[PDB]
Amino acid sequence: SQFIVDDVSKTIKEAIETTIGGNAYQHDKVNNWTGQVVENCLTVLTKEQKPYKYIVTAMIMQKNGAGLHTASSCYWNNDTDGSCTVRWENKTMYCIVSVFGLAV
Amino acid sequence: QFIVDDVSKTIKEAIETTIGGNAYQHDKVNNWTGQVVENCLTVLTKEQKPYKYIVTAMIMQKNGAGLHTASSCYWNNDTDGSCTVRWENKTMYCIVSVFGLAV
Amino acid sequence: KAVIKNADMSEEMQQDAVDCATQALEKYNIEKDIAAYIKKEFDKKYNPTWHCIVGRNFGSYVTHETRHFIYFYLGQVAILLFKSG
Amino acid sequence: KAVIKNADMSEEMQQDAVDCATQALEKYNIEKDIAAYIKKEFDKKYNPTWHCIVGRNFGSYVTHETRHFIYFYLGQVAILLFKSG
């Protein structure tokens, strides 16, 4: 149908909460967390059988007083494509996630 | 139609042109990530292909902090591709990614 | 039962510290051992790095992670538990 | 009389520790302040983050960075001074 920012934002927050919700930075589980986050969102997004290609990226930075800066733009169909970037943080982690939906 | 060696070269150049030879400076980094994104995006769009591009750039101040990124897609494996580049100097880490999708 | 003298920790975590200390006393007699039971217990459930000092006579000056510090009295000993690292 | 019970630090740094402790003991009577004096010298001359426990009766179980630990007695008083950023 079409890229619905509100839904996508829900899927992200959800995924984030599951994977890292209530944990502390640990290089141990980090690789697997960030991985599960993208995989979950992707699992959900695709399941809706919509006519879209999706791109999901996630990054977790160990909160530690370090400066972090990101930027993103696209060259696509500003009429049928969309994106949502969610910021999430807790005691020890800075987490950013993005999902880009590009029409068929 | 998406050549990874091509884009990788563009990315690296864009990184060098923008932050190559400078040190982390809070109120200058925001300008830098944006340039790297515009730089890469400008070069990629000239060759007006029936492709869509997504470009993300991030710069973290080296401070012994941990950083992990992950990404994946649901696209056409036969046409769409991507290139992620790790980069770093004395004061900062940089990660740039480009994704290409046809149609 | 316990008396929280000074603290910077959530309520549930505080309760947890008391609970853990309560049991540590039921299983050990020497101060150094009570500490270990506590220190190890916290490291597991709330993540490294914790430090515990148990005694009847001592002063202290330590630096700690926010929301992770507590000094209380229980039984015949004082208990200092804090995260740093 | 200084007695290094358990130590893990530069021979020079150990001496440095004992010295500072002695001075502390003859400037303050309250253990709490004794600790403070010591901990502050090491955060200054050897970078943060140091922790000190000064008492006559206590047990502990702490974690520390290599080469940055020492548990020496100075008279009847026991001094625990370790680093754990």
């Binding site: 007083g65 696209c74 169909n77 | 944006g34 | 330590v62 926010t66 | 309250i30 008492g55």
Partner: peptide
């Protein structure tokens, strides 16, 4: 199809000196 540039998005977490606390405790007597 009509392709074009999207808006630009930026995230900026400024560098901050972590805030730590130093406590002092003392046994009575």
């Amino acid at each position: 199809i009509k392709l074009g540039m999207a808006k630009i998005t930026q995230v900026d977490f400024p560098p901050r000196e972590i805030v730590t606390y130093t406590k002092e405790t003392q046994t009575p007597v």
